[PDB]
């Protein structure tokens, strides 16, 4: 949890729909955004911390 990877994404087209295809019992809580309006705002860099 202290040594987390930080992936840097580049110019591409992200499909935020495969996130809910895995096994059930998973949370999708957002902060400041919404899943239905996620594909409306334009972002420069998205960083994933696992």
């Amino acid at each position, epitope marked *: 949890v202290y*040594a*987390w*990877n*930080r*992936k840097r994404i580049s110019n591409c087209v992200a499909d935020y729909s495969v996130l809910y295809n895995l096994a059930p019992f998973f949370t999708f809580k957002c902060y400041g955004v919404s899943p239905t309006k996620l594909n409306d705002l334009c972002f420069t860099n998205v960083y994933a911390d*696992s």
Partner: antibody
Amino acid sequence: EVQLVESGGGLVQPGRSLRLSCAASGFTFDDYAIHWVRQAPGKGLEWVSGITWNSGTIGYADSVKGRFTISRDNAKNSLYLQMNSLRAEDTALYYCAKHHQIAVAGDAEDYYFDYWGQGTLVTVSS
Amino acid sequence: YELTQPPSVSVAPGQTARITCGGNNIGSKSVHWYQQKPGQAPVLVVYDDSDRPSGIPERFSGSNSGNTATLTISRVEAGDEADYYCQVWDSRSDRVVFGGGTKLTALG
């Protein structure tokens, strides 16, 4: 091409701690796995630990659990290994090996070394 | 896991040698091989018994049959004397099980 510079090693008292480092040069430090594997003088080799392309531990041996801690740094492109509670049976040449495959998402767990280094003599005695 | 390797195998530089690595039920998992020269750095040889890295000639080959992985070296010379190691994955324990390498020495 590939220059895996290994640093850290010397004479330390039994029970102390140290930090070994392996820096890559030549390839991208985001799509290759790197492992630490010791080699006793004239007594074969012994795998210590390893980390995949991302920040992920793969496991350890049956005699190094709880004492060693491996970490990865993609910002500085370096694999670090912290060793604690060293004993007399930890004197070997710790080699920093790379991986050949790109370690795609969906595959089978099969990691094998492709490039080797020089190793650092880390002796533990009084 | 635990691999069993011959302590030392010597052969004249006229025929091929027999470097075998066997286990208990190793029939489908991948088997890799490495060649470390004494004093220098190890190098990769024919792995998975179905392909070879870039630079390794056709002299090296690997063959798995049931419970024995054999590393066949063709036309062994004086400059081929090194320590051959065989590596397996053994996903049951999440480790990398090595073994005592064989010191191939060209006799004669």
